[PDB]
């Protein structure tokens, strides 16, 4: 199989972290391409990351790519995980996109950035707290953790935007970030540059709604 990634694209974070799950089941070749490069034949506009499967089909959704890697390792679909992935797609991503807009495109700081995601962060913190398990759905990190960690990383890697009163979130996020596949993914995507690396990608995005 071939996985297509690009520099400074945040969606490449969770997939790179998940790719190790394919070990012993299939080989994942990693190919780095440009931002305006179109790899999927049926898609008009460039999209990355993309996974070209051995069957010749394409996965163009980051969560579906992570799911596929986990499924290869023998992971089994559960309602809680689906629930988290749907919430990440439909509620967290736009909140995160807005916050990252204000932060990296319009150079704001503080509550002008945090305001748009505090509700989402608080929801994660409170879920982790009411569970007695260290990870989102399980005793060990799983699909939901990788997907959520991958979305959150470009913001929360800066401690200014991880409120310490949200202690469960802070512990969970720090734990995931120190795991080797997450460390390797962050290095490959952001290289050493922090959040600035993302700037070119974030420019192209639609603008958000209101405060």
């Amino acid at each position: 199989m071939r996985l297509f990634v690009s520099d400074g694209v945040p969606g490449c974070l969770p997939v790179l972290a998940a790719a190790g799950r394919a070990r012993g089941r299939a080989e994942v070749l990693i190919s780095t391409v440009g931002p305006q490069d179109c790899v999927v034949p049926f898609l008009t506009r460039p999209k990355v990351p993309v996974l070209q499967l051995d069957s010749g089909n394409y996965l163009f959704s980051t969560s579906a790519i992570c799911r596929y890697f986990f499924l290869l390792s023998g992971w089994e679909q559960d309602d809680l995980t689906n629930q988290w992935l749907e919430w990440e797609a439909t509620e967290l991503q736009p909140a995160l996109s807005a916050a990252l807009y204000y932060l990296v495109v319009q150079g704001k700081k503080g509550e002008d950035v945090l305001g748009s995601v505090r509700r989402a962060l608080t929801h994660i913190d409170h879920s982790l707290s009411r569970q007695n398990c260290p990870f989102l759905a399980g005793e060990t990190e799983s699909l939901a953790d990788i997907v959520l960690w991958g979305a959150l990383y470009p913001l929360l890697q800066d401690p200014a935007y991880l409120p310490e009163e949200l202690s469960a979130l802070h512990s969970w996020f720090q734990t995931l970030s120190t795991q080797e596949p997450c460390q390797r993914a962050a290095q490959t995507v952001l290289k050493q540059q922090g959040v600035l690396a993302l700037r070119p990608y974030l420019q192209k995005q639609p603008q958000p709604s209101p405060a």
């Binding site: 506009r45 089909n57 579906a64 596929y68 499924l71 309602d79 992935l85 749907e86 919430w87 797609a89």
Partner: protein, 168 residues
């Protein structure tokens, strides 16, 4: 778009569930919520949909291999992020073009097996397809062929209007 509770009643029927579940709505986007038996909450359209499919013991609708399961979930996500994110006729033409290219060599979204992805994409696209001109239905011929096929698949259409296609 259809209200989620309306869509879930449609799905329940397609599935053969007796049943009638009661769905509350949460937040400003009216995200459907299902009190499960029993008894934590399940939240979100595609989340609840995959739960009903299991409940009806028709898990093949979620895909039968790792690849098919991934592809199903990719199109469910596509449904709730791309299709439900547009209105009328603008944006929708890029979408239809891409769907048209993808379906050039496929009967169903995943290939040769009918899945939950086909059901929900059909329910989600119905409001656009029903407003297509004869010209547009010819332009997006592969979409037309797939949609025409789903709308006759047993028990899926229910009360939804049939769209006229010719052939093809």
């Amino acid at each position: 778009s259809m209200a989620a509770a309306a869509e879930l009643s449609l799905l329940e029927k397609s599935l053969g569930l007796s049943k009638g579940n009661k769905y509350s709505a949460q937040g400003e986007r009216q995200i459907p919520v299902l009190q499960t038996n029993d008894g934590p909450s399940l939240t979100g359209l595609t989340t609840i949909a995959a739960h009903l499919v299991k409940q009806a013991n028709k898990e093949y609708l979620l895909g039968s291999t790792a690849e098919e399961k991934a592809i199903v979930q990719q199109w469910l996500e596509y449904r709730v992020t791309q299709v439900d994110g547009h209105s009328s006729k603008n944006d929708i033409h890029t979408l239809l073009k891409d769907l048209n290219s993808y379906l050039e060599d496929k009967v169903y979204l995943t290939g040769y097996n009918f899945t939950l992805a086909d059901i929900l994409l059909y329910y989600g696209l119905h409001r656009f397809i029903v407003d297509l001109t004869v010209q547009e239905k010819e332009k997006y011929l592969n979409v037309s062929r797939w949609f025409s096929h789903i709308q006759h698949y047993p028990g899926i259409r229910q009360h939804l209007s049939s769209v006229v296609f010719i052939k093809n």
